[PDB]
């Protein structure tokens, strides 16, 4: 219509005929299929006329494509120098970025615009800004051989590395306007020191709230680990600085989160005794049941010294904890699918076990569940659980004749060979049970042919004795 007349004649550099189309009621800002506009294909090509006029008559300079170039990228990439000025003056987005990250920056870096970077670094520039590779406008330069331009961005970066040890300074003082300035001329928030602590970390360690939430509106990693896997929030915790662990916590940070040590933040809250955070960070999920390596859980450390109140909400925590861990069990031996997923996602354990040892894989294999055995070990449920007589979930399939569920178990590590006290090994039971399909399945996986309960019986000996030929021949054919 009255558009395409324009976005054509906008890249033919038909000058006088793009102010008869605008006279008569032509939309400035139309776009076509892809989404370029009349201001991109002018700067595209190159029609620095063209350009200014349609920005006397309106156009929008920051104006986005399908993919997110705007005219400066187009100005960038074909490295028309007058039309990058003009569109800067008029407040183009220096560091607009397209869905692969690339800046106009990275343009003029690639494709060798001198004049171009120290034009758009006059104007702000990002010099660090990474593309979907992780690669800076100084990578690129030096990757296609611009030598000049990987001069000039290497100059800029080692001044900005001067910012980014100020900022760790600055956020360790509390000098929350020194930050703002810090970051506001380049210095990156996600530095870190020889032993990997962020400003975050600095920030949170003294005190700073202020500090720590601009550092997070400038995209602050909130989970960053230092050296030793400690946090932010570890370091909150530590302190006592409720408000901050606040924060943290609604900004993504890991409640769970261990150091080298096995130490969480419910740990140091406990050990040194602060209510309110042990409160906040239960709130948000944290796991009562963390040991370190010293099999410390965070109540331990609590009645250890002397932090009663702690050590009493921590009691009632497990509490009801070890009556989920009760209902997984029955849960589990009963096929209640549905009810295990959700005893599972409110914190019980897959591991549990009863007086007689016997864990929820054992019930679901031994009842023939599988629903229950495949979400058990998807979450982590020993497969070799011993229960007090030398019992896995693979002699209780075995026993019992469940086909599938013991090739779900040998599919994941399950012992083979394993014997209880007796000496019965789940070759024996199979054989003994005439399940002549877990025999074949078990052979092939190793089944020693040759072992022994303490009566000297082989699995061979077993069949034989019970009256099962076919499997007698199986187990003779092997040896």
Same mark, same amino acid.
């Given at each position: ?144 051989? #611009? ?7 290497? @100059?800029?970066?080692?001044?900005? +590395? *001067? !910012?980014? &040890? ?117 709130? #948000? ?7 370190? @390596?010293?099999?410390?859980?965070? +109540? *331990? !450390?609590? &009645? ?176």
């Amino acid at each position: 219509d009255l558009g395409k007349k324009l976005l054509e004649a906008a890249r033919a550099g038909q000058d006088d005929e793009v102010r008869i189309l605008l006279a008569n009621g032509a939309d400035v800002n139309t776009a076509d299929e892809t989404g370029f506009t009349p201001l991109h294909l002018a700067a595209w090509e190159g029609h620095l006329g063209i350009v200014e006029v349609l920005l006397k008559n309106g156009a929008d300079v920051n104006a986005n494509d399908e993919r997110g170039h705007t005219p400066l990228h187009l100005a960038a990439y074909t490295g028309h120098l007058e039309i990058v000025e003009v569109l800067l003056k008029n407040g183009a987005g220096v560091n607009a970025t397209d869905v692969i990250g690339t800046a106009p920056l990275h343009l003029a870096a690639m494709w060798g615009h001198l004049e171009i970077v120290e034009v758009l670094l006059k104007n702000g520039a990002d010099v660090r800004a990474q593309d979907k590779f992780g690669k800076t406008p100084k990578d690129l330069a030096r990757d296609n051989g #611009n030598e000049w331009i990987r001069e000039l961005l290497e @100059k800029a970066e080692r001044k900005l +590395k *001067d !910012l980014d &040890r100020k900022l760790l300074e600055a956020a360790r003082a509390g000098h929350r306007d020194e930050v703002e300035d810090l970051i506001k001329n380049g210095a990156d928030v996600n530095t870190a020191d020889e032993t990997g602590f962020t400003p975050l970390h600095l920030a949170a360690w003294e005190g700073h709230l202020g500090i720590v939430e601009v550092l997070l509106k400038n995209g602050a990693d909130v989970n960053a680990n230092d050296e030793r896997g400690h946090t932010p929030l570890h370091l909150a915790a530590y302190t006592g600085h409720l408000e901050i662990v606040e924060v943290l916590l609604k900004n993504g940070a890991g409640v769970n989160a261990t150091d080298v040590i096995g130490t969480a933040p419910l740990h140091l809250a406990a050990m040194w005794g602060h209510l309110e955070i042990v409160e906040v960070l239960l709130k #948000n999920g944290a796991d009562v049941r963390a040991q370190d @390596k010293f099999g410390k859980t965070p +109540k *331990d !450390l609590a &009645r250890d010294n002397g932090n009663e109140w702690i050590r009493e909400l921590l009691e009632k925590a497990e509490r009801k904890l070890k009556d989920l861990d009760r209902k997984l069990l029955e849960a589990a031996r009963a096929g209640h699918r549905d009810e295990v997923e959700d005893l599972i996602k409110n914190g019980a354990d897959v591991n549990t076990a009863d007086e007689t040892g016997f864990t929820p894989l054992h019930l679901a294999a031994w009842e023939g569940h599988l629903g229950i055995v495949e979400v058990l070990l998807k979450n982590g449920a020993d497969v070799n659980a011993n229960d007090e007589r030398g019992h896995t979930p693979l002699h209780l399939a075995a026993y019992t004749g469940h086909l599938e569920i013991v090739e779900v178990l040998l599919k994941n590590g399950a012992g083979v060979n394993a014997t209880d006290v007796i000496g019965t090994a789940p070759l024996h039971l199979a054989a003994m049970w005439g399940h002549l399909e877990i025999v074949e399945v078990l052979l092939k996986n190793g089944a020693d042919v040759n072992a022994q309960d303490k009566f000297g019986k082989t699995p061979f000996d077993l069949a034989i004795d019970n009256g099962n030929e076919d499997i007698a021949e199986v187990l003779q054919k092997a040896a």
